[PDB]
Design a protein around this ligand. Structure first.
Ligand SMILES: NC(=O)C1=CN([C@@H]2O[C@H](COP(=O)(O)OP(=O)(O)OC[C@H]3O[C@@H](n4cnc5c(N)ncnc54)[C@H](O)[C@@H]3O)[C@@H](O)[C@H]2O)C=CC1
Ligand SMILES: [Br-]
Ligand SMILES: [Br-]
Ligand SMILES: [Br-]
Ligand SMILES: [Br-]
Ligand SMILES: [Br-]
Ligand SMILES: [Br-]
Ligand SMILES: [Br-]
Ligand SMILES: [Br-]
Ligand SMILES: [Br-]
Ligand code: NA
Ligand code: NA
Ligand code: NA
Ligand code: NA
Lengths: 497, 497, 497, 498
């Protein structure tokens, strides 16, 4: 009954997957913890099993990673960059099958599964150049006969805890950067995407082994909250990068603070699109559709709040309802499918709870609101009008395709309403007005980490730093000088005289 | 009875000080909380009194600072830099009397009191240029017809809690940089340096008033742990910069993380000098003396551990104990004095307690270890030989002039011994060996924030970022790109097509 | 009789000027060359005299400057910054009287004279901060046990040749930056602005001498083409910064290239404003007025071409003609005057010849075109319609207030017409269209060094690099990383193993 | 059978797409109506194959096609330009052994160095892919309310690239990779004696562009000599001219470009010194000096030509160097583990003999070498001369041959001055353990060169740094740090949005 044992899913064997897989890698493969079965959300059928990390496995892995670090930190950064280059190429070779796995086990559509792998490929290619650039200034000392230099060094072991919804790319952004920065990594992915974590780790492990390097440079310990908490409490984990809910992230951040560790937190979002009266509606409508319903509303950057100027509110709502009706639903790996399932049955329950709460708080479901009558975790993408901007349910992140729509009149009030929530990840305005655009980007504009114009809330690329403010946690990944979070600065005065 | 009422201390009135002073400034002066008297630690005489902040005063001041922010954040950064330029000149004008107040109330020697004010003047002058530079890159988007820009904006209200020992410079580094970055400030200084906080605030207030700017841009709420905890818990304080003990700093860090605020933590040190066999002993001996006994051992960067190669250990210790015997003791503001009192009686008790625990743990006091028989809080600067490098008292920061001396033989072990403690502020080696120097600066070298060569642990200048790692808390102040901690990054994609 | 000998000009003596002044400074004052008398362009009266540099003076000065460099280059950059801070304050003390001298000898209105001095003060203030920043990265070597550092060192002697029209500020930009970068300076200003060059040099000389530094760090050799040519040919002049005509600059550039020196060329402009149909005309008209007629048309950044969309051409021209008629003409020291004389009688002749050439080429003088019947070098500010955009006289820089007006229809053609001239200094569009703005800033936009939107061609500030492309010569001054032009880069690999 | 390409043992040449006669113009189309040149193997003086160079008409057509191509290329986002450069890196990777071998065959340097050049190009390509997501300027805080201030960088347009014989792949590669990601189109004129290498490289690039449906004139080739080079130097359509070559020609090129207010990037001659202090590790100094002086048969721009040795250690170092020189394996440069090949031309051999005689006239003593080797091809003995004054005319002159001039010194100040007294300013190296001396060398009273090295010879450089020299070396930089800015135009842009 396991999908991996069915002829049609034989392609899973191309990723080295079998009926039961080792979920611990530290140079050797193992797993003496609980065996987990993951399921395909499109049909609720079991795919395969992963043997998770026991406490002893965790302990052994940390020690081995730290031993490997002594070798790795001695390799020149440009040479570490060559390893990351080879990782990029290894990912390229497995792009279709790895993206197909993301669609199968996570449930996003194929083009996005593949796109996710491509993101990891792209950050590897970026990191190769960065590996010849990272460092600080040599500064002019006020003291005669002295040099003053800013040095950057690896922090050591970078733990990486990742969410279900970007089961490849988030790890990738962290890995590529942490690696070139001279750190070793320990990955604990989402339990419900354990096969993806295993598959990615196999690809990287082959590269490390082919280059005669210790595998524990990119260690894996599959597990749940138990392993995650161990990481958060472990003084040997010098930086903990955590991508996940604000509720869990808060606790991770506190645990890391308690031990004077470093954390990089990438937490929840409650992202707004705002359409002004001068907006190009031919642009607004598809943008909002994609931002709200893409990945079945399971992106951290998903649009969950849509503010529309009173003058165009009804036309936009009507056009969006028509667009929602045209959405092609089906198995996420099938041709021309744009809409797949929610990742879990619990997510379906949370969706229904949110819809009922929206109604009690005074909103009207104008499209959707129900579970679809078909196998898997499918729900109707949903549009709610009539809530106050400050409705409790609108201020909460429900990780499901529910879009709350609000009217507004003026720019000052709607910027404030963008900013009034506790989340601070992404935000977008649609307008042609030059001044309004630069005000949006300025100190009285959006308070979010991602501040977009005429592109929706999921608009981001490798070259920029990615993350948010407020309850989104403050960390940054990927581009700009995000790398500095994975290194320790020293200010060094050398008296040579 | 109060020093300010004696003709010889009439100069205090040049700083706007009176017998009883208001300790709250927000545009207006007040203070409804407890009245504190501060004392001269050289003679234990009372200087004057300060009316501290009640809860109502704090609430009033936060609200006024937040209102002022709306005005201040709209002022172009270069024009903010002009205000900072004027602050610099205003401090210049009062450098001698302000330096004298620092010597009187805090107890450091006049040249260091004056030097502290000069540090604030210097960071103001640096910040004037920086106000025309702060920002991020315009990056090449992968999307045709799109711009990608990294913007930086003020965080809002910067709370600044400072320690007794640098009662002007630490505030100054935070103020000058926070200001040019478009933030408003709220200062809560050490209670035992309340007159200094008031004096500095008077100087800045006049500049803001003369420029028709709201005074709450540089607010003051004198108080103790009550006010400081309020600040740590206040969601209205967007960034809390805290300089102080690790113990307190840990709790402040936790309170800020609980509310998803930002913290900048500048905590304790336990700084090592390491003298290799090829060291210039004519440089090591006076460097170690200054690093260990300067400010009566009350710098966060004070040398508390001295590792000496076995071949030269006895010669250095003997030469150092001769040097200690020559130190000139007196009132810290008096001519040619090099050594003043400890800041409080409690510090004397802690000094005595450490000296005795050092003995319980097996150390030998080879110079000092006694209180001095004279008015004020004077202790003998102390050298302890014989302890194991891992003696619990050597691993503890005792904020007094006790120098623990250790033998070593090889480089790798002594680098490990630098690094074994929980603190990570400053470190220094004295050697001529080129390879050893670059190894010290590299990934297997010092783990500290300040990594020095042939200059002691007290060596730093405004052009570099200042701060530590591990239990020192990770924050940076002053130079390089420390300004980024006082601002929020956004990554902005503009579809202009 | 000399104006300086009349009682109402006694304020000239506040600048230390006398009836005959030494025009050579190198630590000592002299000048054995020809004695020049300078004249006020508002009335053609002689002001005072300056003893210029002979060949022997020049030779002695270059030798003394290179000797001074030995000392200066050994002073830490931040301490050089301290000298520059003091120069800025010394300029502040004399801002009104120096500004008055600029109005008298050069002929621009008083607010611009004072503004010019303020520009030098402001670049000094900027440079103080930059003196703690200048340098390059420490880079990650691909070689184990090697360091890789980019160092920057002074070039040595920076010769600075300046134009008549910004007789303080151009020198200032070069001086402040060159100085903090560890260079010594040799100034030859415009002979018709000799008193200004002397006055500025007296201010700097006092700072250097007060600080017991050799005065040849900021040397002065007043003279004409002879001294300028010597500088261009002198291998001891490591960098020659030349601000002036394209014609002269081309020859300076070739002379410097022949000897493998460095040049920084800041040459002519032919700057266009373009007004699109969506422009705010209440903004276009006053911006075009200021940009065209400010400084009597004698800025390098003066608007000389105005392209107006066909829909709005006649209205814009009608509004400009009206605005020109309200210009207040007179003595540039009269506080209500907005328009003074051209700098020389030759300039009047060139103006007249350009006006008559414009007519011969088919243009219509719609406003002005005549020499004014009054004392001094006054001409009417002039507007010419009806020429083709590629009319010969329109492609020529005539350094006088003549604005050539053209119609256009589409964006692509008008961007091409901005770009078709040989000059490449400044450019401006007036529009509200977001896409057009970004395209203007992009690879198919303006080809100039200054690319402005909704602000005219004279829009620039010290934080940015200033200069142009094409026949404007390529050099940059003032902000961003313009400082690198005044230093030599080295790429340094250190094998420490 | 006369041509090496028609002999069976060199059939590997065809793996590069080379034939008996090859088109030496590429602009999307291949051609060449100019003079046919035959290039020769310096190891055996045999002709390899032929290349049809550019006529004036070819040049004109190619510049026009390049400028049309620029309109398309500059509109492609920089990261997508980066992706093309990535693919160029991979295409070079595929041909690395055979293109390296052609470098050894046509140019004459040993195989590890020919392979090494191709690897350098691969490596700068990989660097440029990251850089393509990074290039740009700051957004600055305007002093004006309601205004933005932005520093923008845009392509200059057409970058002409003239290269020398001695790095016939790597120098083009550094310029190409960077120019391309910066949105420029390129026009290459390589050394005539390395025409086959230019053709082979251009075939690799052409295939990548054409496979990606891009116009090939993005990376155009016009093989030729001084006539084509001069045209480029005079052409207003060539926005930046990057010239690598002799100081004598580079001066003229720089003057032509300046005359027309174009931009030049000049990478000219060197006269590079190694200085060994009394405290130097001799076990390091000797092999370093050997590699730096004799590597590439003395035909690197960064070749060590002057060796200053402290009086106390001079005789020992010279003796050890003479011993090491006698142990070098000589052979055909494309054979693995041969360490010493021929000079590039018969003319270069004659100039070597002339320089040795000049050294003797000026009072020097040849303590090793000085003669031609008794073997086929342009082989000369690597040569050590002692006894000259540091200011000897022939020591101040760049002779592109393996002649090392050795000098004694006593004091640091004097020997730093002697490093600096020549007109060239490319590379320099000291060997010492003294911390202060090392930082003084790096400081304002130290080396005046563009490359300033410590305990590694004069040929020590890597792609992450900017590469180039000062003084008569011409001032240009290639490869790393912010060298890219020379391939772009800066604009300072004020936007009033209020
Ligand atoms: N790009 C920029 O920053 C600026 C450019 N300019 C340009 O300057 C020109 C107006 O100023 P002018 O003083 O009339 O220019 P000019 O070219 O006649 O003279 C400029 C300076 O060069 C000197 N000089 C004259 N002949 C020389 C020679 N053969 N060799 C060396 N130096 C020589 C003059 O004495 C003077 O100091 C305009 O073209 C204007 O656009 C003016 C200000 C700024
Ligand atoms: Br998007
Ligand atoms: Br107020
Ligand atoms: Br110190
Ligand atoms: Br005339
Ligand atoms: Br303006
Ligand atoms: Br022809
Ligand atoms: Br032809
Ligand atoms: Br010859
Ligand atoms: Br090397
Ligand atoms: Na279902
Ligand atoms: Na006492
Ligand atoms: Na007149
Ligand atoms: Na031969």
């Amino acid at each position: 009954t396991l999908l991996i044992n069915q002829p049609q899913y034989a392609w899973l064997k191309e990723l080295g997957l079998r009926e039961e897989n080792e979920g611990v890698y530290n140079g050797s493969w193992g797993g003496r913890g609980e065996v987990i079965t993951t399921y395909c959300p499109a049909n609720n059928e079991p795919i395969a099993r992963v043997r998770q990390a026991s406490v002893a496995d965790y302990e052994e892995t940390v020690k081995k990673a730290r031993e490997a670090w002594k070798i790795w930190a001695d390799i020149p950064a440009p040479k570490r960059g060559e390893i990351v280059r080879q990782i990029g190429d290894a990912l390229r070779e497995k792009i279709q099958v790895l993206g197909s796995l993301v669609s199968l086990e996570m449930g996003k559509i194929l083009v996005e599964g593949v796109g996710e792998v491509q993101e990891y490929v792209d950050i590897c290619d970026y990191a190769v150049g960065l590996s010849r650039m990272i460092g600080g200034p040599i500064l002019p000392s006020e003291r005669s006969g002295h040099a003053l230099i800013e040095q950057w060094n690896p922090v050591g072991l970078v733990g990486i805890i990742t969410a279900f919804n970007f089961p490849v790319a988030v790890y990738g952004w962290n890995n590529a950067i942490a690696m070139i920065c001279g750190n070793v990594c320990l990955w604990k992915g989402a339990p419900t995407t354990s096969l993806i974590s295993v598959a990615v780790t196999k690809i990287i492990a082959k590269v490390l082994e082919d280059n005669k390097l210790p595998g524990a440079i990119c260690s894996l310990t599959c597990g749940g909250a138990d392993i995650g908490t161990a990481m958060a409490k472990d003084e040997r984990v010098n930086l903990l990068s955590f991508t996940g809910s604000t509720q869990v992230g808060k606790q991770v951040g506190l645990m890391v603070q308690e031990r004077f560790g470093r954390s990089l937190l990438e937490l929840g979002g409650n992202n707004a699109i705002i359409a002004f009266e001068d907006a190009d509606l031919s642009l607004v409508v598809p943008s909002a559709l994609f931002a709200a319903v893409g990945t079945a509303g399971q992106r951290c950057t998903t649009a969950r709040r849509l503010f529309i100027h009173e003058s165009i509110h009804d036309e936009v709502v009507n056009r969006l309802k028509k667009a929602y009706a045209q959405i092609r639903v089906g198995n996420p790996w099938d041709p021309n499918v744009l809409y797949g399932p929610l990742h879990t049955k619990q997510a379906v329950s949370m969706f229904l709870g949110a819809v009922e709460e929206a109604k009690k708080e005074g909103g009207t479901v104008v499209y959707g609101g129900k579970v679809m009558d078909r196998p898997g975790n499918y729900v109707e993408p949903t549009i709610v009008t009539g809530l106050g901007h400050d409705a409790s349910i609108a201020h909460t992140e429900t990780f499901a395709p529910i879009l709350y729509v609000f009217k507004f009149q003026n720019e000052e009030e709607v910027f404030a309403w963008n900013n009034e929530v506790k989340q601070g990840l992404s935000s977008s305005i649609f307008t042609k007005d030059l001044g309004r655009i630069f005000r949006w980007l300025g100190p009285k504009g959006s308070d979010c980490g991602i501040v977009n114009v005429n592109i929706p809330t999921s608009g981001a690329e490798i070259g920029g730093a990615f993350g948010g403010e407020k309850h989104t946690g403050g960390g940054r990944e990927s581009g700009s000088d995000a790398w500095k979070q994975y290194m320790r600065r020293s200010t060094c005065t050398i008296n040579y005289s």
